[PDB]
């Protein structure tokens, strides 16, 4: 039988390609192999399905940061590698593409989706605090401000890449912007 993750992947594919309005639970059930009633057991409405997709595209990242940390990357290199991985994931992964598209549509999706930006901001602030204490971060740079700036800039870069080029050029666009941001952050 199909798992929650399998249903979520199918839902992600459809939301990424069609948006919330154009997606249906009927089409998710067909894609994934099961009846609508069976899907509703896992996700009782289209709204709850959308929420689960957005939540998942955030909740995955703490574990990634832990994987990087235990390899001994410095605080600022940890932030860099997280954003590298995010860029590849928006490029490739339907759950990320769907999470972003659902959040793009938030003003006209009647569903209580998680607040954008704040999870990644909170996530990155921690290594950025360590970077400050360590002497890695340029004097006067506030870690909370750096976290906000990085998340907003990265968000904007990936959004532009999506809107204009379906994220095909995302890695180059991130490289050129990251070079400036990290030049400004490094002591």
Ligand X SMILES: CCC[C@@H]1OCC(CO)=C1C(=O)O
Binding site for ligand X (CB under 6 A): 86, 99-100, 103, 116-117, 120, 151, 154-155, 158
- 122 touches its own copies (CB under 8 A): no
Read out DSSP for 94-125? Answer: HHHHHHHHHHHTGGG--S-PPPSSHHHHHHHH
- 136 touches its own copies (CB under 8 A): no
- Could you say which DSSP state residue 138 is in? P
- 168 touches its own copies (CB under 8 A): no
Rounded distance between C-alpha atoms, residue 183 and residue 6, angstroms: 41
Show Cβ contacts of residue 55 under 8 Å, excluding neighbours closer than 6 positions.
114
Stretch that binds its own copies, among 23-31, 42-50, 54-62, 104-112 (CB under 8 A): 104-112
- 102 touches its own copies (CB under 8 A): no
- 187 touches its own copies (CB under 8 A): no
- 148 touches its own copies (CB under 8 A): yes
CB 72 to ligand X: min, Å: 23
Show Cβ contacts of residue 145 under 8 Å, excluding neighbours closer than 6 positions.
none
């Amino acid at each position: 039988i199909k798992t929650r993750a399998q249903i979520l992947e199918a839902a992600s594919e459809i939301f990424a390609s069609r948006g919330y309005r154009g997606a249906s639970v009927k089409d998710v059930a067909e894609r994934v192999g099961m009846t609508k009633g069976a899907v509703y057991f896992h996700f009782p409405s289209k709204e709850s399905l959308a929420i689960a997709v957005v939540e998942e595209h955030y909740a995955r990242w703490p574990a990634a940061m832990e994987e990087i940390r235990i390899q001994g990357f410095t605080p600022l290199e940890t932030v860099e590698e997280m954003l590298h991985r995010a860029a590849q994931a928006f490029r490739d992964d339907p759950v990320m593409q769907a999470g972003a598209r659902l959040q793009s549509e938030r003003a006209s999706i009647d569903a209580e989706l998680p607040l954008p930006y704040v999870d990644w901001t909170h996530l990155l602030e921690v290594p950025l605090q360590d970077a400050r204490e360590a002497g890695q971060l340029r004097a006067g740079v506030d870690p909370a401000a750096a976290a906000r700036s990085l998340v907003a800039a990265f968000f904007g870069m990936q959004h532009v890449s999506d809107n204009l080029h379906q994220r095909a050029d995302i890695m180059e666009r991130w490289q050129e912007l990251r070079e400036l941001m990290f030049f400004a952050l490094r002591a």
